[PDB]
Amino acid sequence: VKKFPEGFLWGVATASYQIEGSPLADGAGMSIWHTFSHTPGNVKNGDTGDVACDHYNRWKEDIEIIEKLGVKAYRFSISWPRILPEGTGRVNQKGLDFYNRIIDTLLEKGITPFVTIYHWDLPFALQLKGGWANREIADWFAEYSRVLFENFGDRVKNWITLNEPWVVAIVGHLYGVHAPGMRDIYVAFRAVHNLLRAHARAVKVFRETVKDGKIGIVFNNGYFEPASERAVRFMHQFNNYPLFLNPIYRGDYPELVLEFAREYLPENYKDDMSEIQEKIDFVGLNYYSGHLVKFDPAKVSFVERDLPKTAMGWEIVPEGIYWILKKVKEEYNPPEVYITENGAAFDDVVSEDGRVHDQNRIDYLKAHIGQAWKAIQEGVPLKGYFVWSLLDNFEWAEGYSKRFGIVYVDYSTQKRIVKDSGYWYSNVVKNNGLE
Numbered sequence: 001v002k003k004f005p006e007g008f009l010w011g012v013a014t015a016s017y018q019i020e021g022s023p024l025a026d027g028a029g030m031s032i033w034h035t036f037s038h039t040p041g042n043v044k045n046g047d048t049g050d051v052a053c054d055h056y057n058r059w060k061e062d063i064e065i066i067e068k069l070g071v072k073a074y075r076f077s078i079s080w081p082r083i084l085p086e087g088t089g090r091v092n093q094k095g096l097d098f099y100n101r102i103i104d105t106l107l108e109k110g111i112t113p114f115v116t117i118y119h120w121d122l123p124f125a126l127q128l129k130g131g132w133a134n135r136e137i138a139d140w141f142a143e144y145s146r147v148l149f150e151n152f153g154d155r156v157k158n159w160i161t162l163n164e165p166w167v168v169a170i171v172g173h174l175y176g177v178h179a180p181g182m183r184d185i186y187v188a189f190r191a192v193h194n195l196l197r198a199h200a201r202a203v204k205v206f207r208e209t210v211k212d213g214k215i216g217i218v219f220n221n222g223y224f225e226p227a228s229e230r231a232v233r234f235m236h237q238f239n240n241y242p243l244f245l246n247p248i249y250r251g252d253y254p255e256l257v258l259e260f261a262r263e264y265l266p267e268n269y270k271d272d273m274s275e276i277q278e279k280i281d282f283v284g285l286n287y288y289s290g291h292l293v294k295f296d297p298a299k300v301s302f303v304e305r306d307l308p309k310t311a312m313g314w315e316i317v318p319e320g321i322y323w324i325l326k327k328v329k330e331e332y333n334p335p336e337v338y339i340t341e342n343g344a345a346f347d348d349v350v351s352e353d354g355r356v357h358d359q360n361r362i363d364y365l366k367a368h369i370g371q372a373w374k375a376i377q378e379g380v381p382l383k384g385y386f387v388w389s390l391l392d393n394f395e396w397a398e399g400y401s402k403r404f405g406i407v408y409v410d411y412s413t414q415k416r417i418v419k420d421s422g423y424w425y426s427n428v429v430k431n432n433g434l435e
């Protein structure tokens with residue numbers, strides 16, 4: 001038996017473009033994920049977020065699933081171009097109304113909204129002006145965030161500026177695998193820097209607008225282990241929270257990031273560091289897998305290990321979640337931490353019995369929840385844990401071919417089938433831990 005602290009926030013998480021569909025409904029502007037996925041060759045099977053889980057219509061049912069499962073928190077994101085179709089200036093009341101209804105429904109059901117302000121669907125109109133490459137995005141983002149705080153901050157008290165700014169910068173602008181699909185290392189590091197400035201500006205406005213709320217930021221993290229007996233030190237500093245937390249807490253990028261990337265950063269990047277240090281209330285960590293890592297003349301390659309893997313091909317390494325939780329306290333001692341995403345893709349099928357017997361996912365969640373428990377026992381101020389995801393959904397460049405949900409979605413009918421893992425999780429939430 002592993003019981004969690006009183007009032008521990010058990011959650012599930014989604015993102016607007018991945019679940020909503022109807023990207024252009026009710027006066028919404030195009031996002032970069034709309035244009036990226038409608039470009040041939042970018043997404044597996046030519047899949048797009050045009051329909052997705054149709055959450056844009058089915059939102060009430062979906063929240064009723066959250067309620068029935070007894071889940072206590074919902075992390076969801078807001079589509080920037082639903083709110084400001086051109087990115088700045090005009091505010092679309094119908095986009096505000098869409099999320100207002102979600103927010104009021106969650107509150108009425110006593111479910112705590114965690115709102116991710118940016119989970120990757122930049123307005124296309126701002127991408128035309130360079131998007132994350134343009135320093136002015138700190139102003140655009142601040143204006144957007146202000147709108148959200150002004151309209152929703154009376155009810156929503158827990159806010160996340162950015163989901164996984166490393167992914168946004170590097171996967172979007174160096175690897176070219178995500179929107180806006182670019183491969184320029186100088187643009188990618190200017191996006192890193194501008195994401196920090198935009199984050200800090202948004203926190204600054206939050207303090208002026210929502211005096212009773214909490215705001216944080218979310219980072220992706222891998223558990224990197226050395227193949228033999230430094231490449232690990234670099235992967236952690238670059239791929240994990242330190243890329244952003246070293247600026248936020250210490251006023252500079254980490255040491256091995258500067259060694260590799262100084263030339264790609266703006267020359268006078270330090271001038272912005274004072275503002276980047278804006279105080280945050282919590283850190284969200286997303287964690288999924290581990291990686292065997294070796295020097296290789298970025299001077300690092302991964303090494304395949306046996307290990308059970310998910311359908312993503314991601315090595316299942318549960319002690320990784322413990323390690324990253326301990327490590328973030330050891331390095332930056334944030335006052336609160338949340339696991340804002342943890343989950344697994346498996347090749348789910350509906351059995352003849354009408355059920356989805358995803359024991360593989362139960363095993364994955366159970367193992368990680370157990371390790372997060374361990375971290376709490378050794379003093380990590382973990383305040384919550386969010387399963388990625390409530391629903392099978394549009395998995396970015398993998399399209400619909402990867403299912404991460406604890407609820408199965410039959411996309412032909414939009415039927416939701418609660419998976420064994422969903423039922424299992426509901427029991428964990430009800431009991432406030434494992435047994």
Ligand SMILES: OC[C@@H]1[C@@H](O)[C@H](O)[C@@H](O)c2[nH]c(CCc3ccccc3)c[n+]21
Pocket residue numbers: 015018163164167171220221286288341388395396404
């Ligand atoms: O891959 C599953 C989930 C996504 O559906 C979420 O939107 C996103 O927040 C998220 N981040 C990660 C870990 C970082 C990552 C992103 C993209 C590709 C590979 C790793 C895994 N996930």
